[PDB]
């Protein structure tokens, strides 16, 4: 039994060689604040965020693409592996876990340890964009310039793939989480209202956009929270234009990372990218008009992936059947 795991800062996906995606749940875990006992893991836990009594603590152990709260992350990972196997047993499956390219050796050691402690007989780490390319069948083993821009909840990764490896890359810790925060901050500074992270995510999903257009400007939705200047509950409406402005600095950072990667890419590979185009993927890349904006800024065609949410998990599991690539991945156990 072999599984691919996309342990995202926002959502976790597990691909089981033989049937596909068997786990797709928010990366949240809730525990009894006194006993430490796990109450819920997944969606039911996410639904608790910002709504818990003092007796319960809802946690998102993954941050910036890496482990931020070790033990909690450990038990959550075990829960997911157990669920992927279809209940806990004495079988230790082989596991491949996606990771940002800019990960440190220490952060890298933590994920390998966690994988083993969580119940894996052996763990392998695969770079995010590489897993996404394999999961989307991009023929990564060929000598063809393939630039992938993967935006998740914790990181934005830009990589030029060729011959089963990454030639050049940039990795910044500005992605989905920073988009949510940007909206929270915008509402607080503009209307003096405090809203939660989940309400900000809803806004991002319902009217988030990064390219100007009549249609985008007309988009609207409401948000509810507490007016910090009056101490009263308050509901107000946000429009596409406002949100686009709130996400400006984040988008600027993303565009910049793409330009910087292109600049240092070997000329023959750049030649390939101009003809092939840039591959845009990841849950954080779904902002309205993001492809439009990147294409206009780089002057190069941008293509959105067809399975932006599952590509990474699929690729992590599929890499097990590619000895040439697998043999180069760092592992443990």
Query: Does 201 belong to an annotated binding site?
Result: yes
Query: Does 155 belong to an annotated binding site?
Result: yes
Pairing, β 62-63 against β 66-67? antiparallel
d(CA 311, CA 20): 11
Which of helix, strand or coil describes residue 32? strand
- Name residues whose C-beta falls within 8 Å of residue 15's C-beta, 6 or more positions apart in sequence: 3, 4, 5, 21, 22, 310, 313, 314, 316, 317, 318
Among 156, 159, 231, residue whose Cα is nearest residue 193: 231
Query: Does 265 belong to an annotated binding site?
Result: no
Tell me which H or E stretch contains 221: strand 220-227
In the numeric block, the tokens 């439009």 are attached to 292
Query: Does 123 belong to an annotated binding site?
Result: no
Query: Does 285 belong to an annotated binding site?
Result: yes
Query: Does 198 belong to an annotated binding site?
Result: no
Residue 23 CA: distances (Å) to CA of 1, 125, 299? 15, 19, 38
Token pair in block for residue 161:
């793939």
Pairing, β 278-281 against β 302-304? parallel
Query: Does 156 belong to an annotated binding site?
Result: no
Query: Does 154 belong to an annotated binding site?
Result: yes
Query: Does 286 belong to an annotated binding site?
Result: yes
d(CA 258, CA 158): 6
Residue 16 CA: distances (Å) to CA of 43, 91, 93, 129, 140? 20, 14, 10, 20, 21
Pairing, β 156-162 against β 165-172? antiparallel
Query: Does 199 belong to an annotated binding site?
Result: no
Query: Does 240 belong to an annotated binding site?
Result: no
> CA geometry: angle at 304 spanning 302 and 306, to 5°?
155
Annotated binding-site residues read: 9-11, 153-155, 201-204, 283-286
Annotated binding-site residues for ATP read: 9-11, 153-155, 201-204, 283-286
């Amino acid at each position: 039994k072999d599984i691919g795991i996309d342990l995202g800062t926002a959502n976790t996906l597990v691909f089981l060689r033989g049937k596909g995606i068997v786990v797709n749940e928010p990366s949240v875990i809730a525990i009894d604040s006194t006993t430490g006992e796990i109450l819920k893991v997944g969606l039911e836990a996410k639904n608790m965020i910002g709504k818990t009594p003092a007796t319960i603590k809802a946690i998102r152990p993954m941050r910036d693409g890496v482990i931020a709260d070790y033990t909690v992350a450990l038990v959550m990972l075990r829960y997911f592996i157990n669920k992927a196997k279809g209940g806990m047993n004495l079988f230790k499956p082989r596991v491949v876990i996606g990771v940002p390219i800019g990960i440190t050796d220490v952060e890298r050691r933590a994920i390998l340890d966690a994988g083993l402690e969580a119940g894996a007989s052996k763990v392998f780490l695969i770079e995010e964009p590489m897993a996404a390319a394999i999961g989307s069948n991009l023929n990564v083993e060929e000598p063809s310039g393939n630039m992938v821009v993967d935006i998740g909840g914790g990181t934005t990764e830009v990589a030029v793939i060729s011959l089963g490896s990454i030639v050049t890359w940039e990795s910044i810790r500005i992605a989905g989480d920073e988009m949510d925060e940007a909206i929270v901050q915008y509402v607080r500074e503009t209307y003096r209202v405090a809203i939660g992270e989940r309400t900000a995510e809803r806004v991002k999903i319902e009217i988030g956009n990064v390219f100007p257009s009549k249609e985008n400007d007309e988009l609207e939705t409401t948000v509810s929270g507490i007016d910090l200047s009056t101490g009263l509950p308050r509901k107000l409406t946000l429009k596409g234009g406002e949100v686009r402005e709130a996400l400006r600095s984040v988008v600027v950072a993303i565009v910049e990372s793409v330009r910087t990667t292109l600049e240092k890419t070997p000329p023959e590979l750049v030649s390939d990218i101009i003809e092939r185009g840039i591959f845009l993927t990841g849950g954080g890349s779904l902002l309205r008009g993001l492809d439009t904006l990147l294409q206009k800024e780089t002057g190069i065609s941008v293509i959105r992936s067809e399975e932006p949410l599952t590509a990474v998990a699929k690729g992590a599991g599929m890499v097990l059947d590619k000895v040439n690539i697998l043999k180069k991945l760092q592992g443990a156990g």
